[PDB]
Amino acid sequence: METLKITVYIVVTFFVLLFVFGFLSGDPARNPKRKD
Amino acid sequence: AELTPEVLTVPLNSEGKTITLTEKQYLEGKRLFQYACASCHVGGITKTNPSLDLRTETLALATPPRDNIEGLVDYMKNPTTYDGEQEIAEVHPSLRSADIFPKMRNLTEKDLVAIAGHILVEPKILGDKWGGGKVYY
Amino acid sequence: GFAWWAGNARLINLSGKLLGAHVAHAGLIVFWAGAMTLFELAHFIPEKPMYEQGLILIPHIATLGWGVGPGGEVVDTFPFFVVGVVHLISSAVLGFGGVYHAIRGPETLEEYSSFFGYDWKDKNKMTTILGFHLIVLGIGALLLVAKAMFFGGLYDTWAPGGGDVRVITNPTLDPRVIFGYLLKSPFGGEGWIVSVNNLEDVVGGHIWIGLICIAGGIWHILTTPFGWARRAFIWSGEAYLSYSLGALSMMGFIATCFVWFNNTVYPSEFYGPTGPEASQAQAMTFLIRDQKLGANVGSAQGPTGLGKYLMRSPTGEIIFGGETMRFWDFRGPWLEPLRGPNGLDLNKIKNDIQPWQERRAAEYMTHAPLGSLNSVGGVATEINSVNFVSPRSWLATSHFVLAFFFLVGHLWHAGRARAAAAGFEKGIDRESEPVLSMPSLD
Amino acid sequence: GTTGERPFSDIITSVRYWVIHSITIPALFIAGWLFVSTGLAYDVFGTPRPDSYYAQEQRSIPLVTDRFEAKQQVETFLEQLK
Amino acid sequence: RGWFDILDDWLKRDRFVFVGWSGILLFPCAYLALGGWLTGTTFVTSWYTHGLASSYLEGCNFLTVAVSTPANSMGHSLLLLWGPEAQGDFTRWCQLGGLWTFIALHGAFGLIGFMLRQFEIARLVGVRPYNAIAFSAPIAVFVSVFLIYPLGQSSWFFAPSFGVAAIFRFLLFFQGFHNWTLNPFHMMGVAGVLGGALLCAIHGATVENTLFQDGEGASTFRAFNPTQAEETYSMVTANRFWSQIFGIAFSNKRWLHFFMLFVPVTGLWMSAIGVVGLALNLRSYDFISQEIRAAEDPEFETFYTKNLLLNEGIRAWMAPQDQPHENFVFPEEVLPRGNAL
Amino acid sequence: ANLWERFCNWVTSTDNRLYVGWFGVIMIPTLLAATICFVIAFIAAPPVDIDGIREPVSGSLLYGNNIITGAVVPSSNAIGLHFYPIWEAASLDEWLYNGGPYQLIIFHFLLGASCYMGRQWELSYRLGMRPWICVAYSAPLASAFAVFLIYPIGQGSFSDGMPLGISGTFNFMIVFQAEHNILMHPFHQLGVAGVFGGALFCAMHGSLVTSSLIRETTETESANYGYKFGQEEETYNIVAAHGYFGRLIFQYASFNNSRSLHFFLAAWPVVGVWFTALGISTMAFNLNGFNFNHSVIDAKGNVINTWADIINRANLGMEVMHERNAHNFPLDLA
Amino acid sequence: SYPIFTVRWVAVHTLAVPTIFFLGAIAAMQFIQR
Numbered sequence A: 001m002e003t004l005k006i007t008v009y010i011v012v013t014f015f016v017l018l019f020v021f022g023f024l025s026g027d028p029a030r031n032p033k034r035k036d
Numbered sequence B: 001a002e003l004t005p006e007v008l009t010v011p012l013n014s015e016g017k018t019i020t021l022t023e024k025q026y027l028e029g030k031r032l033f034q035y036a037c038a039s040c041h042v043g044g045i046t047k048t049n050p051s052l053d054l055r056t057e058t059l060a061l062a063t064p065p066r067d068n069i070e071g072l073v074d075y076m077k078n079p080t081t082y083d084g085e086q087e088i089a090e091v092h093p094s095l096r097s098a099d100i101f102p103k104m105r106n107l108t109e110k111d112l113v114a115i116a117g118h119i120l121v122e123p124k125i126l127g128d129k130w131g132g133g134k135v136y137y
Numbered sequence C: 001g002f003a004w005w006a007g008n009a010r011l012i013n014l015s016g017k018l019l020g021a022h023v024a025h026a027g028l029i030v031f032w033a034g035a036m037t038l039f040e041l042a043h044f045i046p047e048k049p050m051y052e053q054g055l056i057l058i059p060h061i062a063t064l065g066w067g068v069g070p071g072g073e074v075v076d077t078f079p080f081f082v083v084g085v086v087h088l089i090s091s092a093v094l095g096f097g098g099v100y101h102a103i104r105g106p107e108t109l110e111e112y113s114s115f116f117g118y119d120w121k122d123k124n125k126m127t128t129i130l131g132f133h134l135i136v137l138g139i140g141a142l143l144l145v146a147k148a149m150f151f152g153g154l155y156d157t158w159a160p161g162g163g164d165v166r167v168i169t170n171p172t173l174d175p176r177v178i179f180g181y182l183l184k185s186p187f188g189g190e191g192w193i194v195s196v197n198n199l200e201d202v203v204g205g206h207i208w209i210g211l212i213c214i215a216g217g218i219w220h221i222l223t224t225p226f227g228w229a230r231r232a233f234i235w236s237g238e239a240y241l242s243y244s245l246g247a248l249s250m251m252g253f254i255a256t257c258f259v260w261f262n263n264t265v266y267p268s269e270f271y272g273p274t275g276p277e278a279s280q281a282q283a284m285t286f287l288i289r290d291q292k293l294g295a296n297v298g299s300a301q302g303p304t305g306l307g308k309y310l311m312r313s314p315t316g317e318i319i320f321g322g323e324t325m326r327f328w329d330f331r332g333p334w335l336e337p338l339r340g341p342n343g344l345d346l347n348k349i350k351n352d353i354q355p356w357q358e359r360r361a362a363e364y365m366t367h368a369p370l371g372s373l374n375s376v377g378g379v380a381t382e383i384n385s386v387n388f389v390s391p392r393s394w395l396a397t398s399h400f401v402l403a404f405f406f407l408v409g410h411l412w413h414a415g416r417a418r419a420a421a422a423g424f425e426k427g428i429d430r431e432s433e434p435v436l437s438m439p440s441l442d
Numbered sequence D: 001g002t003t004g005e006r007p008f009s010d011i012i013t014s015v016r017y018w019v020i021h022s023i024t025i026p027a028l029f030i031a032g033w034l035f036v037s038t039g040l041a042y043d044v045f046g047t048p049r050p051d052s053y054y055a056q057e058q059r060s061i062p063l064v065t066d067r068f069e070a071k072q073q074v075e076t077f078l079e080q081l082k
Numbered sequence E: 001r002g003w004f005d006i007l008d009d010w011l012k013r014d015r016f017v018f019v020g021w022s023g024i025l026l027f028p029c030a031y032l033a034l035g036g037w038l039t040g041t042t043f044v045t046s047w048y049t050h051g052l053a054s055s056y057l058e059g060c061n062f063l064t065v066a067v068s069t070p071a072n073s074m075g076h077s078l079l080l081l082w083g084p085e086a087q088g089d090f091t092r093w094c095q096l097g098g099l100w101t102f103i104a105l106h107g108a109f110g111l112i113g114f115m116l117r118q119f120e121i122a123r124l125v126g127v128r129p130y131n132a133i134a135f136s137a138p139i140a141v142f143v144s145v146f147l148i149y150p151l152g153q154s155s156w157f158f159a160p161s162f163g164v165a166a167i168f169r170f171l172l173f174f175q176g177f178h179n180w181t182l183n184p185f186h187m188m189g190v191a192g193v194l195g196g197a198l199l200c201a202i203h204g205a206t207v208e209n210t211l212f213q214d215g216e217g218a219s220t221f222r223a224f225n226p227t228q229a230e231e232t233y234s235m236v237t238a239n240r241f242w243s244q245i246f247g248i249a250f251s252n253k254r255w256l257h258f259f260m261l262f263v264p265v266t267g268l269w270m271s272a273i274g275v276v277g278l279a280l281n282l283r284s285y286d287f288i289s290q291e292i293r294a295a296e297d298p299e300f301e302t303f304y305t306k307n308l309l310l311n312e313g314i315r316a317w318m319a320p321q322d323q324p325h326e327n328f329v330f331p332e333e334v335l336p337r338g339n340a341l
Numbered sequence F: 001a002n003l004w005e006r007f008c009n010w011v012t013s014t015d016n017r018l019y020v021g022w023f024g025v026i027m028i029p030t031l032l033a034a035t036i037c038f039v040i041a042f043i044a045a046p047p048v049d050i051d052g053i054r055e056p057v058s059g060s061l062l063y064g065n066n067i068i069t070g071a072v073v074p075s076s077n078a079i080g081l082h083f084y085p086i087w088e089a090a091s092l093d094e095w096l097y098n099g100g101p102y103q104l105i106i107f108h109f110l111l112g113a114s115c116y117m118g119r120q121w122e123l124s125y126r127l128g129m130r131p132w133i134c135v136a137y138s139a140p141l142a143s144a145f146a147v148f149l150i151y152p153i154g155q156g157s158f159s160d161g162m163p164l165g166i167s168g169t170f171n172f173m174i175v176f177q178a179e180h181n182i183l184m185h186p187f188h189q190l191g192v193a194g195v196f197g198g199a200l201f202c203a204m205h206g207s208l209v210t211s212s213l214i215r216e217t218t219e220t221e222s223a224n225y226g227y228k229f230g231q232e233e234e235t236y237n238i239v240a241a242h243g244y245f246g247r248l249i250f251q252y253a254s255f256n257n258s259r260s261l262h263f264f265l266a267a268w269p270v271v272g273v274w275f276t277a278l279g280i281s282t283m284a285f286n287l288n289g290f291n292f293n294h295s296v297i298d299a300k301g302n303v304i305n306t307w308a309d310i311i312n313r314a315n316l317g318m319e320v321m322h323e324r325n326a327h328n329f330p331l332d333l334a
Numbered sequence G: 001s002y003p004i005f006t007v008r009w010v011a012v013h014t015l016a017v018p019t020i021f022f023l024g025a026i027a028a029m030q031f032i033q034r
């Protein structure tokens, strides 16, 4: 169960981190008109 | 049908004497019962001990008999268990315990008669619904 | 280019008219706080518990320790009058400044004075305004500390002897306790910050927040946004409004759960029992009644095979039976005297329940937070008679509704801010449609 | 895009409109009121007054139980009040 | 050009309220059905048919007033004012439930009038008659619920009464007695109605968020001219959006708007069919396999069995007051009740 | 052109057949987790003690259910609002008996559907569109949050959240009526107006546009072939449509602005469903539908029943039978 | 130069006149006592 708890903790942290940093990677600029 | 003096006539004591409430008294008593009593006795039941109701036939069998104005007014000052064996002012609203039940503080002697009268009249209007519970809603 | 129905949007770039809009609207809030309080006082009957009377502001003042004494009994109503009058009076001044700035004062401020004027795209000016307001909020949080420590204290439902106004001499400063709350799970038996169950933690948390807000206020006066922040955000007045809209929505949801579960900073004495509390009080009521009749409440097996009065929680604690098993995380001053290390203690139950505990349980069972919209108390099948809806239901429901619409407002204004910032909030340029310049998906 | 009737906005902002209708509107209201305050509404529609749902010592509904004798049944109940 | 043509001329003149030949049927019947409802809900009791108060005059509010159905003892009488039951007496007519048949029957001819109006105006103006077609679903619902259902039962008494709470009671009656949630024809109507509301919202939102910029104002409403030939929103960009969000998207604006006709209209047609079954107590009440297992195996329990206990609750607790003409007397001891409650 | 900027560029790419996006990065796994657990539990989960009384309710197909009666059963009342992940159970056997899979499904689902809403914002921005489709979808999303999260929180148990099954849904809505009188609650009444009216206006709009299609085809062809994807000209005549509907009612009850018509289509059911979701969400804190029980009485004091009293009789039969073994005391307070 | 009495005129008063009457009847009702 502890193995599993640990796995899931790691998996969630991974995807949450991708989310936060993805939106910090100049997301306003990723659109078809005015980029900045 | 209407609120006739016959339905407003209730027993005053166990001697058999009677008192004829007014419509004003009956409605005053209804309002006071809601104010001070209904949170537990809505409809003549007892939410915190459903084995004991405000039905007339139940009050008749209480020790001190309580199917009369007097017994009810005494109950509101010094409540006892159903067999009269123990005083329960400390867990039941009463004038004796208005320190711990503050809604009893501003009740006058005439207010007690009005509450007592409402309780004795209401089963005459409502029958089994009074004290009967949800079967009869 | 806005229509009459979006007319306040015409204020985005009129800093002087928009200032009057804000100050006049603050007048309305203070007005309400004053009028509402005086309304509640005119109607207040002190012999009745506050929670039979439809009161929501008087309970907030009592909780701060004004007007009450031991057991929550109201001793002096004059602090209620004062709080109402002063708010009412102050709304006139806010009203005066707001209408003056909306009708008569400079339409824009940035020509009248470079200190009060602002451009939404000025990240330095904007963080400075934010910094001032943080310092102000920090002061506010420290005024609660001032009251608790140096000016009479707060109402403590957990005080010995039925609750009382108590002075807080040792506020919790240990950061493992204060911040440990923020890291508690929001699920059951944890409850995040809603589980705060004592005034030392309440007061010390406000010490912390006051210092953090003053610290951060000074920080934002002295700095400007780092480039990573500059790139993550949209820098516009509507974007700023949308950020605040999400914040208030979050806060409204938290407050909903606070008033529904917490009986420390919302004393049940004033607000009525919590749902969980009332349900626990019912099981207590009939345990008391049946044991007086001779029932051995500990050994009584109920229909399902679980104890009729008492059973175990999933981790073993002795808890009340029947459907209230779900509410065993409930803790309250009337109940805790019966708790031992393993949960409810059968020897305390058999020997040590007091009439005041009997009274309180009976009171709370009969004032459970259930009632109709037209204020008939109780379960939906109950007949008319009892005029009652718990202040907890009124506060919970209203603020759920407001929190929901402000998250809608957040999404509305965040999406429009994004699109206005990229230049396509009025629609698609027929001559430069992005999809027509993309390859097709198949 | 009009069919020739006078515009509503023009009628209700008109002095003549309000000279007629400041009489007709309150008069009909007063008529409606009197229909009830006099009692006529009860007798017309056959609706029990608060004292005539039951006979004094009666808690039985006066339910129609016959199709072709229903009219008379109602009448019999009504006379069980007089 | 004789009198028939001159009257045709006049019925079909362009005025604020078009009349037409359908107007002869529609206008008196709609006015009488609506006025009968307002008259009865303001002034008329249900004391002799139902043992209920049901008018403002009696103390009821908008939620509890109704025009209630006639007594079960009337059977399916038309309850004509001049018929053998009321015999010309207006007062008795009201007290026997005559306004129920009055409203239902004039309502039915009213709907016929309205649907003929849709045909009439469509022919005159030159459009295809699909709005008339779609209105067939409301008619099917009305005649199946308000006429067929009570005609297969014992009397009008069991039709819906025309009131807010009276209709709420009708919903609950159908659960306890017909187990109508379990009926697949209702389930298809539910999907037709919720399906339509989704279509309504999703299509409106889509148009409003794929608009072309056709003016400079922040209010995008002004940049539409009803005579412009050009589409006002990008079907192409809408199509891309939904293909990438949801997988599939509309590509044919005619199919899209036909589908919006089809979905709710078919839903309502389906529910009507099931109610026709319930006219005959031809219910989808049980699953036989479930009942065989459960009778034999007291440890077998499903949401299906749990809901029939609720039904049984509803029947025994509501029947004596909801069917006063049966004189159901259920002693306390026979009422089904779980523990404590 | 560094590894990260390339990943970012694929995540947000408008060329992907299904748009992913940053919201999609959370949405995809949470939805796959909920979907797989749901399917497996629906088919094979063993019976679940929903109400904490060791009276397990069989939900799955292999344990004697059909599609209509099947459900993934809510987690045990003994658990209440406690968090019950797999790793908190002594075994999967235990987790299965106490309804663990329900919690896993409703939490992954509420998360992934929330991210679905934001995904709808996100692609609108990448495509140059206006942004408020996601606002439309917040009405259904809020309704799912109400029945799976808010109502559990207010009543203190996920065992009173809505079951994931057809008949379990009906059980949830019958019990709700018994306890909250949702029918006499005005926010539910506004939901009915939202969904009935939205079904109406769907049929209206679809029949009026279909009524005014311009002749482009023969009677041997589907009329639908008279429209070609991405043609610039409108495919129906709105002024004919207005000329018909304005005569059916009267002129000013008909739209001639297609923009305000479609805004109206969007707004009526969205707002009606916000209210009905707010109804469930506030009855979660027991502010219930109007109570007119015994509100009418005669000159003597007899109760004069109305239709609300009749409603009350049916509500009582529902109350006293539900969860018939799970109450030891006379009031069902949660 | 408008007409006063029209088909429109009639539909309006057919609805409006009984409305005001019924509103008066229902206003009076709030003062009935049992």
Ligand code: CLA
Pocket: C004, C005, C006, C007, C008, C009, C241, C245, C405, C406, C407, C408, C409, C410, C412, C413, C416
């Ligand atoms: C701090 C809160 C706040 C602030 C300052 C603003 C500010 C603004 N909003 Mg936003 N909005 C908010 C919250 C907020 N909003 C919330 C919570 C929602 C969700 C409902 C929205 C949804 C929203 C929409 C949909 C739109 C705006 C728009 C706007 C702009 C024009 C608004 C206007 O002129 O309204 C004028 C005011 C009215 C027309 C009155 C509204 C009346 C309400 C709906 C009825 C409330 C009645 C109440 C419930 C009581 C009933 C009892 C009865 C007696 C009345 C302006 C910048 C517009 C915009 O984008 O501009 C850029 C726009 O189209 N807002």
Ligand code: CLA
Pocket: C003, C004, C005, C006, C007, C008, C009, C010, C011, C014, C017, C018, C020, C021, C022, C024, C025, C092, C094, C095, C096, C097, C099, C102, C103
């Ligand atoms: C809290 C609510 C609130 C507030 C504070 C404002 C504030 C404002 N609005 Mg918005 N607005 C609101 C609600 C609000 N609005 C709503 C609900 C709608 C929907 C109809 C609008 C629609 C709207 C439009 C269409 C416009 C505004 C505009 C404005 C600004 C200029 C108005 C003007 O010139 O007044 C002129 C009005 C008067 C001279 C009339 C008298 C007003 C006084 C103040 C009445 C109140 C008196 C009060 C009792 C005084 C007590 C005195 C005491 C303090 C001494 C002003 C700052 C305008 C704007 O943006 O300008 C660019 C504009 O065009 N508003």
Ligand code: CLA
Pocket: C019, C023, C093, C094, C096, C097, C098, C100, C101, C105, C106, C109, C112, C113, C116
């Ligand atoms: C946050 C709200 C706010 C803001 C940003 C402003 C900002 C401004 N105002 Mg407005 N004003 C406000 C509220 C506000 N005012 C209120 C509430 C009123 C009504 C009393 C007025 C009445 C008013 C008038 C009549 C005039 C202005 C003017 C001005 C400008 C110059 C101010 C100046 O030099 O004073 C600098 C500072 C001082 C003079 C000393 C202020 C000391 C204060 C009173 C003490 C601190 C208060 C405390 C923090 C909170 C209240 C305590 C309470 C909680 C018990 C500036 C743009 C002038 C203008 O626009 O002319 C063209 C002008 O003539 N204001």
Ligand code: CLA
Pocket: C127, C130, C134, C182, C183, C212, C213, C214, C215, C216, C217, C219, C220, C223, C224, C225, C226, C229
């Ligand atoms: C109203 C309050 C407020 C507001 C609006 C801002 C606004 C801002 N701050 Mg300031 N700040 C404040 C209070 C505030 N601050 C206070 C009180 C302090 C002192 C502690 C600071 C200290 C501070 C620093 C040190 C810095 C800022 C910076 C910034 C900018 C970027 C913020 C950002 O990216 O956040 C978005 C948040 C993140 C990117 C991090 C996510 C991690 C959080 C904690 C996740 C939690 C989510 C969870 C659901 C919430 C539940 C509770 C949780 C703790 C368990 C922005 C202008 C930055 C800047 O440019 O400075 C000039 C910067 O470096 N702020």
Ligand SMILES: C=Cc1c(C)c2cc3nc(c4c5[nH]c(cc6nc(cc1[nH]2)C(C)=C6CC)c(C)c5C(=O)[C@@H]4C(=O)OC)[C@@H](CCC(=O)OC/C=C(\C)CCC[C@H](C)CCC[C@H](C)CCCC(C)C)[C@@H]3C
Pocket: E029, E030, E033, E034, E037, E103, E104, E107, E108, E109, E110, E111, E114, E131, E134, E135, E137, E138, E142, E161, E162, E163, E164, E167, E193, E196, E264, E265, E268, F196, F197, F199, F200, F203, F204, F207, F248
């Ligand atoms: C409760 C739900 C509901 C109502 C109230 C309703 C109402 C209406 N739908 C109409 C139309 C439509 N409805 C349609 C589809 C749908 N309609 C639906 C559901 C409803 N439709 C659904 C779900 C759909 C999708 C299939 C279409 C396609 C149309 C139209 O074209 C038409 C329209 O113009 O829309 C704007 C209008 C017909 C007007 C008319 O006949 O005037 C004449 C009035 C008459 C003849 C009187 C009828 C009297 C009734 C039958 C009996 C008496 C009732 C009492 C007066 C009231 C009792 C109230 C209590 C029960 C509470 C009217 C506004």
Ligand SMILES: CC1=C(/C=C/C(C)=C/C=C/C(C)=C/C=C/C=C(C)/C=C/C=C(C)/C=C/C2=C(C)CCCC2(C)C)C(C)(C)CCC1
Pocket: C020, C021, C024, C025, C027, C028, C031, C085, C088, C089, C091, C092, C094, C095, C096, C098, C099, C102
């Ligand atoms: C801008 C604008 C607006 C807004 C406005 C506002 C919002 C305002 C406000 C204002 C205000 C906010 C006001 C206030 C006022 C107040 C006052 C004026 C007060 C006074 C007081 C008094 C006088 C008192 C008295 C008393 C005492 C002292 C004691 C006790 C008793 C008594 C109570 C008697 C509007 C929307 C309209 C529109 C547009 C424009």
Ligand SMILES: CC1=C(/C=C/C(C)=C/C=C/C(C)=C/C=C/C=C(C)/C=C/C=C(C)/C=C/C2=C(C)CCCC2(C)C)C(C)(C)CCC1
Pocket: E031, E032, E034, E035, E036, E037, E038, E039, G014, G015, G018, G019, G022, G023
């Ligand atoms: C039946 C009958 C008949 C007929 C009758 C009629 C035709 C009637 C009509 C009537 C009518 C025609 C009535 C009306 C009434 C109305 C009313 C009563 C109204 C009311 C309303 C209201 C109350 C409203 C209000 C409101 C609200 C609430 C909200 C919003 C606003 C408003 C304003 C809308 C005859 C003689 C043949 C004989 C046989 C029987």
Ligand code: OEY
Pocket: C323, F051, F077, F155, F159, F160, F175, F179, F322, F323, F326, F332, F333, F334
């Ligand atoms: O209504 Mn009745 O109340 Ca909300 O709990 Mn008490 O019973 Mn049980 O578990 Mn599901 O259900």
Ligand SMILES: [Cl-]
Pocket: E306, F171, F175, F321, F322, F323, F324
């Ligand atoms: Cl159940």
Ligand SMILES: [Cl-]
Pocket: C321, C322, C323, C324, F326, F327, F328, F329
């Ligand atoms: Cl229980």
Ligand SMILES: [Fe+2]
Pocket: E203, E257, F205, F209, F262
């Ligand atoms: Fe369309």
